[PDB]
Ligand binder design. Structure first.
Ligand code: 38L
Ligand code: 38L
Ligand code: MN
Ligand code: MN
Lengths: 332, 324
């Protein structure tokens, strides 16, 4: 299947590169490094060889979310976004960009997102879970009240926000002490991101800004399997859930969320997500360079779904969501 | 369907009753405490009315796992088990018992499991995740080396171990701060229990004792959905995983684990589990009294599976597993 669109597709600057060291063995770092740093050459060749037309590119993790001085976070984000704009400009038929944002500061993040969308032509933002800010004794999650004006900006711009993983801070990771093998994509990434997404849904954010679009990778980080139980546990009790949101968690999931196939090339899992959130809200993605493009594409080529849904998940959903077949993207 | 066996079926003694109070609104506590304390009467009438032949009974949560003094923990476990044996003896065709265990002290736990199985006729153990012990700076997980002689005893007795949930300790639960609605069965229970299971699998415990049988409630606490990813993330990297176990995590999941349907009455979830671990390793359970028996049975009656698998999940698999 030619013409696919992929949107969990990462790169690094020299400035952010070392954030990804640790996620593979030392013997494999030279390869990973080379993939992270390459946008124009081998990446596009692999795209051609595996039927990907468009990668929506994003900076690696945690990157800006781990820069605790918010003035410095803003500087790094601006440099990364300017670099990404230049790279997109070199092969504008094959690439679009997601914004890196200094979520340490709601005002700075909102201003940078405006600049990325209006001046740089980016199509959304990607953020690696919670932020570290020296001013806060605690990690910053985006349900907290100070973010609500930032979200108002996201909805006004009408671009999606990709809530990507990061690892929990060590003081929030004691269950994994001695079992470091569970950190990262094995498990801890998914728990961290699932809970952050649920915090957004419970907070009532989507009652106030109901047109927001949030994207989750990895088939939704376990959410579809357990979504029934989130709302329906202890169903004999007739009560009002003790969160500020007005409706069921599943309502916000169904209405405000999209899931990608990144790093979760498993047909059973895809089928469960289809039967829970529907194929209209599922997007192809690879997680290159942490996963192989050929692994992602070969799995998706043959996974057990209808040809109609293979086209929607492969490219139709993303083309519509990111308005890529519209005049502003094609001609301006 | 009559003849079902259910095995996440809870009761409390007066000694452990109040552990359950925080899990329902104040207005529902009278109903809940009456369900927890009743074994012989309404509980059996509801089994009759909804086709359950046998409940395998277990003490409520966290119960013994929250009793920090291990001497006292062992005293509480013994009393609860003696009580449970007495209650089972009144209606022996309808009930069996799971042991409550003082997991704070591996020797005491092994001794109590032996007693419950050989002397009281119990058919396994049910433990509410990690233990708190005054003597330990950290919560106790059962992958830790001091529990291996305990697991040797479980395998020698050849009875299953039900790894049931509890909530994380507050210092290990900051991600849920200002979001207490996520604690308990909503989500925190499953995360805590999935990782405890995974810690067991990656520790190599099942290389050393391969006939161990571990049971998880709630359709396996999200494990089947993400199990491919657990082993196959970053697949282009060719390397030995950095855990002591010799094989893939999925190999231990498939070979040593069984899942129940407790509190997870969702057909899509069941089918995903069927297509990952197989219907021979799934078992009907309700989570009474925290879930209604009628909701559990009515869902299961009509869920979208073969009649052969409805019989196996309903009673066949549990009959084989517990040698009834
Ligand atoms: O998303 N991921 O799962 C992924 C990353 O984006 C960064 C490191 C490892 C990895 O698998
Ligand atoms: O298993 N549970 O989810 C369950 C309990 O055993 C204890 C409290 C509430 C509940 O839903
Ligand atoms: Mn990624
Ligand atoms: Mn239970």
């Amino acid at each position: 299947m030619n013409g696919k669109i992929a949107l969990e597709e990462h790169f690094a600057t020299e400035e952010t590169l070392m954030d990804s060291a640790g996620f593979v063995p030392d013997k494999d770092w030279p390869e990973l490094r080379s993939r992270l740093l390459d946008i124009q050459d081998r990446r596009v060749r692999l795209m051609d060889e595996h039927g990907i037309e468009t990668m929506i590119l994003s900076l690696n993790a945690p990157a800006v979310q781990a820069i605790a001085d918010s003035t410095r976070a803003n500087e790094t984000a601006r440099r990364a976004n300017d670099f990404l704009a230049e790279q997109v400009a070199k092969q504008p038929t094959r690439f679009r960009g997601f914004a890196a944002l200094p979520m340490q500061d709601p005002e700075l993040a909102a201003r940078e997102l405006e600049r990325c969308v209006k001046e740089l032509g980016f199509v959304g933002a990607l953020v690696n879970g919670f932020s570290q800010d020296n001013r806060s004794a605690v990690p910053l999650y985006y349900d907290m009240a100070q973010y609500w004006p930032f979200w108002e900006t996201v909805q006004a711009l009408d671009v999606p926000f990709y809530l990507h993983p990061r690892n929990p801070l060590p003081s929030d990771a004691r269950i994994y002490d001695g079992h470091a093998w569970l950190l990262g994509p094995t498990w801890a990434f998914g728990q961290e991101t699932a809970v952050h997404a649920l915090r957004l849904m419970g907070s009532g954010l989507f009652d106030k800004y109901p047109a927001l679009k949030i994207i989750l990778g990895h088939m939704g980080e376990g959410l579809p399997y357990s979504m029934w139980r989130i709302d329906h546990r202890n169903a004999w009790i007739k009560t009002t859930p003790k969160y500020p949101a007005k409706r069921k968690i599943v309502d916000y999931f169904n209405e405000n969320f999209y899931l990608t196939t990144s790093g979760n090339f498993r047909t059973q899992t895809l089928i469960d997500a289809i039967l829970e959130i529907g194929a209209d809200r599922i997007l192809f993605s690879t997680d290159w360079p942490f996963e192989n493009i050929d692994h992602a594409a070969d799995w998706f080529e043959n996974t057990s779904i209808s040809e109609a849904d293979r086209k929607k998940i492969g490219w139709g959903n993303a083309q519509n969501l990111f308005k890529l077949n519209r005049a502003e993207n094609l001609y301006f």
